């Protein structure tokens, strides 16, 4: 068997394609179940983010496993298999553990430790899933450990990037007071702002946030009133879990143009995958659409990032990688090697039921098994086989 990671990244696939592979936290167990139903898959896990959508699986054979998973991706996203095969991120075993550890540590920016919070959610959701086997789950738990150790002992988000994307420009308006929206508000405070219109389905979360940030003024407007407060502001932050765009061509080209105090152009920062603006909106002259793909225009500098990461985090990553590789093959010779029972038992029963033609046999056997069982540990089991 072997561990495989098969995914799509913001480095290769554009948002309009990745969003079709997007699987919200709801369908995760269902997804994993479907995945394990394939002939060459024993265990599975799904990681969906603004930047990546990756699938971690266990396969008996690599090629057929990748084949099946890719066809599943096609069937569930409605994307031609070869078209996926172009933008396909593929890694096996040790390189896969390396990659996921890198992801947890947050070197794949743009998420430190914000890309780690999305992993604990995976291991917690996958608690009641039988498709979340020992290899992949253990791999993700180890990924959490690596994430934490690399987070605390290093330098070490999409929201802040979005806020700072205002360089392309108060009068603020964020749609969706989720953890993402709350972070956006925080970074709106950080860069000196005291007026935001927070549109949310619930007044509970918005009022809960207002009680945490008494310096900034929070104005609640109903979710179905999103269009009115779109032409009432200059910049709109869409941070909702919608599976369909909230704005389109129709809703935006009749809106009273924003005050020319700041250009007259309205900014639609769409920090959600799947998108909430639908790309087409940008066809209006008095407004522009900036999705998560355009959130790499913050600081194009790889002098500190690459150097510090390679010279500081990679040692931890490699140590923990080889450690997990010393955890994987070792934690599979634990419930399988104890098959030495069936041998011993066969020697125990026979010899007894041959002599009968009980505390003694059980005594000898169990006391002879006390040694090896309780305790280069791979040679401790392989030699017995």
């Amino acid at each position: 068997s072997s561990i495989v990671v098969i995914g799509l990244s913001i480095h290769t696939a554009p948002v309009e394609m990745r969003e079709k592979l997007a699987i919200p936290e709801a369908e995760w167990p269902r997804a994993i179940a479907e995945l394990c139903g394939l002939n060459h898959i024993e265990e599975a896990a799904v990681l969906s983010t603004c930047n990546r959508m990756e699938i971690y699986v266990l396969a008996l054979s690599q090629h057929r496993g990748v084949k099946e998973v890719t066809e599943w991706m096609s069937k569930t996203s409605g994307i031609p298999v070869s078209e996926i095969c172009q933008h396909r991120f593929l890694l096996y075993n040790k390189d896969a553990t390396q990659h996921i550890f890198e992801v947890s540590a947050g070197l794949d920016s743009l998420g430190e430790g914000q890309i780690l919070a999305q992993v604990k959610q995976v291991v917690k959701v996958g608690q009641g899933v039988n498709g979340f086997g020992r290899n992949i789950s253990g791999l993700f738990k180890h990924a959490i450990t690596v994430g934490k150790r690399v987070r605390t002992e290093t330098n070490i988000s999409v929201s802040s990037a979005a806020v700072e994307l205002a360089l392309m420009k108060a009068r603020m308006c964020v749609i969706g007071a989720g953890k993402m929206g709350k972070l956006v508000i925080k970074h709106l405070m950080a860069k000196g702002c005291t007026k935001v219109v927070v549109v949310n389905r619930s007044e509970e979360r918005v009022s809960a946030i207002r009680e945490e940030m008494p310096g900034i003024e929070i104005i609640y407007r109903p979710l179905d009133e999103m269009l009115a407060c779109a032409s009432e502001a200059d910049v709109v932050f869409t941070s909702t879990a919608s599976e369909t765009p909230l704005f389109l061509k129709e809703h935006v080209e009749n809106l009273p143009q924003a005050s020319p105090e700041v250009g007259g152009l309205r900014h639609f920062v769409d920090i959600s995958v799947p998108r909430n603006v639908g790309s087409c909106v940008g066809e209006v002259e008095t407004a522009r659409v900036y999705n998560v793909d355009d959130l790499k225009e913050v600081v194009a500098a790889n002098k500190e990032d690459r150097m510090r990461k390679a010279m500081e985090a990679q040692t931890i990553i490699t140590e923990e990688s080889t450690q997990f590789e010393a955890w994987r093959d070792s934690l599979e010779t634990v419930p399988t090697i104890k098959k030495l029972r069936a041998y011993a038992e066969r020697i125990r029963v026979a010899e007894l039921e041959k002599c009968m033609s009980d505390d003694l046999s059980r005594g000898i056997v169990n006391r002879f098994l006390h040694g090896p069982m309780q305790h280069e540990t791979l040679e401790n089991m392989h030699a017995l086989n």
Partner: protein, 251 residues
């Protein structure tokens, strides 16, 4: 071509190597070659340590080799004029290049510089090579995979023989039999394989679908290629691409 530019290979060899031969003309104009360690600045321009005089004849060559996978040896010869810089500011600029590379303290009055006129670039021994303009050489970038190419090559040669074997079948037009193959080297555009055949030994260049910038991208791209090769061998998806026909006789 699916190989990097000759200038790029030259720069790659000048970054990865540290030892070479300095060829000059002595009195009576007799050729003399002599062992030399070198460092290189951001433009590829080599600085060396000589203990002896550089003669009145400053015309010289610096020949550098890079043995790849114990199989082929790319090489380059920098033709140019040698000299000692006067400015105690550029002397520091050089001694720092040295210190960075070798982690050593260099006797400053031993630093010489070869002004690059042009570079002869070769893939292996027994080849004519392609000449490379100095400005070209200067503007070229060392291959980004150069520090990790040897490792990836060893790993693939030890853990992926089936993939290479299949690669000979589905990617290149081998109009003959194939008994044994290895991978010699890998770079941003693709990789090179040595095919051992009774009819003769050949070198093949198989390109990556897209350019690669690092180890992860490289391994992923390779994985994609071996996957697609497996899928075309057992005939699942069509081979909607182009086959490689350019072979290269070696001994």
């Amino acid at each position: 071509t699916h190989k990097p530019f000759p200038a790029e290979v030259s720069r790659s060899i000048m970054e990865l190597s540290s030892v070479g031969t300095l060829s000059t003309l002595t009195h009576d104009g007799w050729p003399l070659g002599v062992g030399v360690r070198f460092a290189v600045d951001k433009d590829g321009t080599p600085v060396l340590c000589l203990n002896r005089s550089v003669s009145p004849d400053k015309r010289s060559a610096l020949h550098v080799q890079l043995e790849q996978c114990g199989l082929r040896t790319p090489q380059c010869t920098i033709q140019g004029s040698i000299g000692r810089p006067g400015d105690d500011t550029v002397l520091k600029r050089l001694s720092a290049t040295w210190r960075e590379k070798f982690g050593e303290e260099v006797k400053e009055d031993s630093l010489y510089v070869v002004a690059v006129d042009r570079v002869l670039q070769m893939e292996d021994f027994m080849e004519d090579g392609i000449w490379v303009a100095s400005s070209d050489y200067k503007n070229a970038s060392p291959d980004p995979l150069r520090d990790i190419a040897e490792d990836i090559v060893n790993q693939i040669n030890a853990n992926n023989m089936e993939d290479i074997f299949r690669f000979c079948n589905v990617y290149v037009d081998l109009d003959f039999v194939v008994s044994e193959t290895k991978m010699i080297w890998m770079d941003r555009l693709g990789f090179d394989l040595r095919v051992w055949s009774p009819r003769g030994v050949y070198d093949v260049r198989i390109p990556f679908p897209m350019e690669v910038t690092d180890e992860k991208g490289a391994k992923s791209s390779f994985n994609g290629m071996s996957q697609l090769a497996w899928e075309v061998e057992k005939s699942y998806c069509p081979a909607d691409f182009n086959k490689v026909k350019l072979l290269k006789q070696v001994v």
